[PDB]
Structures are given as C-alpha cells and as structure tokens.
Write a protein that binds this DNA or RNA. Structure first.
Length: 534
RNA sequence: GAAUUGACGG
C-alpha cells in the first residue's frame, strides 16, 4: 500500500463526492479503478481506509467489471471475507451482483462469479463459517444463490414482528445448483466437527440462514437436516437423541433447532417430537434458551395426538411458565390450539386457572394478562388491580389476541372480563400500543354485538385523544365500523373537536377522510344517511 | 401501529 495507490483511490473518492460526474461516466470510472486492484485484491480490500472506496467502486460499476473483480479476487476471497473491513468489501460485491438478478441476460455471468466464490469457499469452509465477519458474507452469499437480493431480518436471522406474528398465527429462480453445491460444501465435515458447528454462534447463524432458504424443499431438507443433527428413512437413534437434547439449552444450538422445527417436513418433525422432545417439554420450557425451541415445536405441531401430549405436559404448569417469564410458551400453545381445533376450551380454562385461583379472581383475568409482569412480580397479588400508567405487556396482549380468535363458547370468562372493565381501564387499554390490539381482536371476535357495544360505549369521551396517535386511529376506525348510527355520530363529533390537530398526524388525514368528518361537519343529514346505509 | 425472556461487524 504505497502512497500513490492511496492517493489514487482517495482521489477517485473525492471525485465522486464533488458530484460533478455523470452517472454513466461514474460507472466507467468505477470500472477503471477496479482494474487498479489487480494483484492487490487482499491488500486493497482489507485496508481500513481504502476498503470503503472499494465498496463504492463495486456498487457503482457495470456487471462485467464486477465479475472481473470477483474472478481475479476469488483465490483470496475467504481471506477478504474474514477480515473486519474486507468482509464489507465482499458483501458489496454480492449486493452489486444482486442488482442484476432481474436481468435475464446476466444469468450465466452471475452464476460464473458465484462459482468462483463457492469453489474457493467449499475447499475450506469451517473457519469462515465460524468467523464473525465471514459468517455475514456466507449468509449473504447463500441468499444470493437463492435469488434473494432484498435483506430480511428473518433470513439473517434477527427477531421481527412479522416472525412473532407468524409464530402466533396472527420470486427469482436463483441458482439452485449453486445453492445446493455451496451448502453441501458447508456440511461435508465429520460428525464431530458438526457437533461444534451446532454450538458456535456464527456457524449456527449460517445454517439458520441456509435452512430458511430451503423452506418447502423437502428433498433437500431431508438430506440437510439429518447431517446437521448428526443422524445420517429418517430415524434418530437413542444416543443421538440424547445428545441433541443435551445441547438444547445452548444459546447457539437453540436458535438453530428453532429453524429446523420451522422448516422440518412432516415426517422429520414427528420423529423429532417423539425422540427428542416428547417427555422433556416442561424442563425445556423453563430454560432461558430452550423455551424458544419449545415455542417453535408447539407452533409447528401437526395433529391432535401431539396437541394432547403437549397439553398434558404443559397446561398443568401454565402458572409456573407465567411466573418464570415464559409467557411465549403459553402463547404458542394457545395459538396452535385454535389452529389444530384441539383442546381449545382446555387451553383457555388452564390459562384462567393459572392467573385466577379463587373464583373471585376470575373477573380480573383481563387486567392481569394486560400487565402480566406487574401482576406476577407483585408483592401482594390479592390486592393487585392495575398498573397505572404502565406500558402493557407485549406477550400477555398477544395471548389475549389469540384468545379472541377462539369461538365465544371457549372464552366467556375473557369476554365478560374485558367488557366489564370500568371505563378508565378500557380507556387506558385502548391508548396502549399493545392493549389496542386486544380491543381490536375482541371487536373482530364473535362475541355478541351487545357486548362489543358495551365496551365501545365506555370509550365515549376519548375518541378524540385516541385518534391523535397512530395506534389509536386504527382503534377508532374499528370501533366506528362496529357502531350503529348513534355511536358513529358520537365518534364523528369527537373527532371534529380535534380535527385541526388530527390533520397534522401521520394517520389523521386518512382517518378524517375514511370517516368523512368534513361531510359530517358541513352536511350532517347527508352524512347520517350515507352512514345508515351500512 | 406494541413485537418474547436467550446471540452477531470496519
């Protein structure tokens, strides 16, 4: 890295800043500058300063020069990818490649570039799989081979509200032979190396990504998963099942088996259910790591026999799970009960009994789940009633949202409890970003109209303030849609009083328009006639 | 629109 090389890439960088360069000329300069890297790919790409310029060049050049850079750097690509700066250079090369996925003329030239990369990785993959930087490069490479260009937290694999909502029940072809080739290369180690891969954070993350990209590819999943579990008809031998069970409380492995259970084909799921989990459900549910594996197991159960086993092992202990901070386990059991149509009423009753012991407690099932952590962390639970001002409990509210997807037959204690909360509590619930989802699930449930109406009426006087927030505005429209003319008019006039402020809100203009607040203000008789025709 | 209780970068 002589100073002339340094001056060159710095001068290229300033030239792009000064935005005096046409986008077509910019693209050609990017290509010329890449040629200045030939023979020095590793040195340029891993330089703490020049790597950032090399990212700019890769993202601004044309396909041919990108491919030329990838081909000339392939023999050092694992070294670039495991470097703390070079790994961003490597990822820029992939994002750049990915911008051409929609161009059918580019198919074979992209595939050749991926082959250069996969070939040198497959030759020696295990340290790159476990390297904190190279693991990000492998995840992106796997996505590209699948034809996925657009980043997804799920695939990489972060937690997200789409995934939580999915767990609770609320396309380019790619380069399939390159995906198979690379992922087979990552998995052709000894069973004893694989044991360590199960438990290394960074390699577990790579395998999580690969499993998600193979979703619904049963023939590949049935080859891949047994290698990862060290099983290679699919059968888990008794000693291997013990080893999988023993590793289940590990933070890295627990994340991996979460994904395995999500993508597992039916026959493979059933074998895992029976041989690994079947008599350990509660012990695994109380572990800080394993309980998320149990949530994934619960969510993907196939049939009523499995539902019964999970019921027998876990419902008697619902109170333990809530006390110990494992509400996600209960949420999942409740959610899959409504999905498999099994043990619905047994699940709902076990939840009531877990929160409300004596008969007098049961009218408080709703407040206690809205503030699940305050009630269970309470000093004196026989006097606890509310958490004034507190933020409501995400998972307690998600449980309730599942509860209100049951038929009214199974959830009468929940409907009676919610609809009988006093106005101040119902109002605080609607103003909470989680509690508003509870209200909305109840308005969408098949509870009686009279009962919905009772709750909505206790919101009178607060629709204006409710509407001034993004979450409340949805609740206001859900209440409105559920109302007769008398209450639609009540809500409409409350929004009128706050119409100035409401219009300065993100959602306000839409809400004002959907409810037709201007018509109501200016020609109320015609607004009432159009609403009545609904 | 609130998004679990246990991980990730120059």
């Amino acid at each position: 890295i002589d100073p002339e090389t340094s001056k060159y890439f710095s001068e290229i960088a300033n030239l792009f800043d000064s935005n005096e360069v046409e986008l077509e000329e910019r693209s050609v300069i990017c290509g010329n500058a890449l040629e200045e890297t030939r023979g020095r790919e590793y040195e340029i790409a891993t330089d703490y300063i020049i790597s950032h310029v090399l990212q700019t060049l890769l993202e601004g050049c044309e396909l041919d020069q990108l491919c030329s850079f990838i081909r000339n750097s392939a023999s050092v690509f694992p070294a670039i990818a495991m470097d703390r700066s070079g790994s961003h250079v490597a990822e820029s090369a992939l994002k750049s490649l990915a911008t051409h996925l929609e161009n059918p003329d580019a198919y074979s030239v992209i595939e050749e570039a991926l082959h250069s990369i996969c070939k040198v990785i497959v030759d020696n993959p295990l340290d790159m799989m476990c390297n904190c930087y190279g693991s990000h490069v492998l995840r992106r490479l796997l996505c590209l081979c699948k034809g996925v260009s657009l980043d997804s937290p799920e695939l990489y694999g972060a937690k997200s509200s789409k995934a939580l909502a999915k767990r609770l029940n609320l396309p380019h072809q790619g380069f399939p032979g390159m995906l198979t080739y690379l992922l087979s290369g990552l998995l052709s180690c000894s069973r004893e190396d694989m044991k360590y891969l199960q438990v290394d954070q960074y390699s577990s993350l790579v395998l999580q990504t690969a499993l998600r990209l193979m979703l619904k590819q049963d023939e590949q999943l049935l080859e891949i998963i047994p290698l990862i579990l060290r099983c290679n008809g699919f059968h888990i031998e008794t000693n291997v099942a013990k080893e999988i069970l023993e590793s289940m409380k590990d933070n890295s492995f627990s994340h991996l088996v979460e994904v395995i259970l999500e993508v597992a084909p039916e026959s493979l799921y059933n074998e895992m259910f029976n041989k690994v989990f079947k008599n350990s459900l509660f012990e695994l549910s109380v572990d800080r790591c394993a309980n998320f594996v149990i949530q994934a197991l619960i969510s993907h159960a196939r049939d009523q026999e499995q539902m019964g086993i999970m019921w027998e092992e876990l419902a008697p202990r619902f109170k333990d799970l809530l006390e110990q901070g494992k509400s996600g386990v209960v949420a999942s059991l409740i959610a899959v009960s409504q999905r498999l149509q099994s043990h619905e009423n047994k699940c709902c009753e076990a939840l009531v009994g877990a929160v409300c012991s004596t008969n007098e407690s049961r009218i408080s099932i709703l407040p206690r789940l809205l503030f699940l952590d305050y009630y269970f962390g309470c000093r004196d639970k026989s006097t606890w009633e509310w958490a004034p001002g507190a933020k409501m409990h995400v998972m307690g509210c998600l449980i309730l949202q599942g509860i209100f997807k049951f038929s009214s037959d199974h959830i009468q204690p929940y409907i009676t409890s919610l609809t009988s909360m006093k106005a101040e509590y119902i109002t605080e619930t609607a103003k909470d970003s989680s509690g508003a989802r509870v209200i909305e699930a109840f308005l969408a449930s098949d509870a009686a109209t009279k009962q919905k109406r009772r709750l909505i009426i206790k919101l009178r006087g607060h629709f204006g303030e409710l509407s001034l927030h993004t979450s409340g505005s949805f609740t206001v429209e859900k209440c409105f849609d559920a109302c007769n003319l008398t209450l639609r008019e009540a809500i409409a006039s409350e929004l009128l009083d706050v119409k100035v402020d409401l219009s300065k809100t993100k959602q306000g203009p839409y809400l004002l328009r959907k409810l037709d607040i201007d018509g109501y203000a200016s020609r109320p008789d015609q607004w009432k006639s159009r609403q009545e025709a609904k």
